[PDB]
Design a protein around this ligand. Structure first.
Ligand code: HEM
Length: 212
């Protein structure tokens, strides 16, 4: 069984739980406000910063290299633009760093520094989601908060280097199947992907609690 299929099958149930989390449920209803959106985007800034820092550390490592797509996927630069938009010129010292966010970042550095062979699980969970449900959220966010089609404030959800996300995802899944794979690595990677989904669910549950 190819890794791409193993990952889809391994995370299909927790995905349902994540897509139906209270924060996302409200988001999908269009009940997202500036305060809530700033909280999640600021948390993603910390998360993607840590993820991409570990990706850079392991870009030459064969256990990850085939999936090294900085130009097409990396979000840090986009998030820095969004942070300046939502938080202003001094966003660096204005944005929050919640406990759930720190926990996520913590696991990211553990994987990147000690278990690099599992890094693919974390890139898969965030990036492929960004190119799927993330595109739906972008549309909802634009309508709910009156964000311009010009993209300001939603740079994170925009991939100017990917003409067709559907096609890119297929390329990505295929590339995931070229990584050196053993029963040991395959089992652990699917396990870490489930953990990645849980870290996201816990972030959303936390943010929702902070807002309510
Ligand atoms: C906001 C609610 C969500 C919606 C509307 C949504 C919707 C979708 C849809 C329609 C697909 C299928 C795309 C395809 O076959 O190419 C998908 C795939 C995916 N989603 Fe979500 N999603 C949501 C939440 C999430 C969350 C919170 C995560 C984890 C951060 C996530 C990560 C993924 C991943 C990793 C895939 C790719 C699965 C695969 O093809 O192996 N999604 N999502």
């Amino acid at each position: 069984q190819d890794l791409s299929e193993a990952l889809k099958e391994a995370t299909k149930e927790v995905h349902i739980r994540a897509e139906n989390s209270e924060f996302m449920r409200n988001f999908q209803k269009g009940q997202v406000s500036r305060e809530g959106f700033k909280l999640v985007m600021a948390s993603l800034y910390h998360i993607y910063t840590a993820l991409e820092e570990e990706i850079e550390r392991n870009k030459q490592n064969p256990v990850y290299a085939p999936l090294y797509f900085p130009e097409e996927l990396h979000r840090r630069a986009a998030l820095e633009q969004d942070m300046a938009f939502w938080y202003g010129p001094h966003w660096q010292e204005a944005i929050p760093y919640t406990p759930a966010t720190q926990h996520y970042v913590k696991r990211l550095h553990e994987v990147g520094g000690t278990h690099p062979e599992l890094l693919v699980a974390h890139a898969y969970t965030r990036y492929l989601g960004d190119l799927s449900g993330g595109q739906v959220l972008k549309k909802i966010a634009q309508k709910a908060m009156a964000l311009p089609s010009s993209g300001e404030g939603l740079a994170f959800f925009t991939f100017p280097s990917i003409d067709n996300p559907t096609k890119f995802k297929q390329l990505y899944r295929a590339r995931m199947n070229t990584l050196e794979m053993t029963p040991e690595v395959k089992h652990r990677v699917t396990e870490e992907a489930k953990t990645a989904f849980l870290l996201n669910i816990e972030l959303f549950e936390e943010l929702q609690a902070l807002l309510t």
